[PDB]
């Protein structure tokens, strides 16, 4: 089966909670897996002149967003997979599932 699930949410604190439950369900299901591989966090920067007009000292501000990606590889029959997707639903967290 070698089913794969990835987590690409923007808030870390819920991400760990989603990862924490998923890993503890898998072990008590006694399923072979690889640990959550924590991909590097990519920072999206947008530098912009502060003033709307052109007057004033040249001041620039840089807004940011943080993107955090966790993916965990699982291997189990389909029955366990469907209920896993049915559970662990949290706001701001999108999980995509892929087989092989």
């Amino acid at each position: 089966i070698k089913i794969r699930i990835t987590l690409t949410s923007t808030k870390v604190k819920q991400l760990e909670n989603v990862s924490s439950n998923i890993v503890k369900n898998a072990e008590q299901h006694n399923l072979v897996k690889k640990g959550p591989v924590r991909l590097p966090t990519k920072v999206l920067k947008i530098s912009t002149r502060k003033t709307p007009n052109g007057e004033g000292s040249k001041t620039w501000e840089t807004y940011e967003m943080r993107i955090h990606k966790r993916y965990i590889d699982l291997e189990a029959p389909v029955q366990i997979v469907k209920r896993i997707t049915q559970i662990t639903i949290e706001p701001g967290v999108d999980v995509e599932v892929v087989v092989a």
């Binding site: 690409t8 923007t10 990519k42 999206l44 967003m65 993107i67 990606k69």
Partner: peptide, 11 residues
């Protein structure tokens, strides 16, 4: 792209 998918949600 995820860099665009996530900003799309903000949009």
């Amino acid at each position: 792209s995820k860099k665009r998918k996530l900003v799309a949600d903000g949009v």
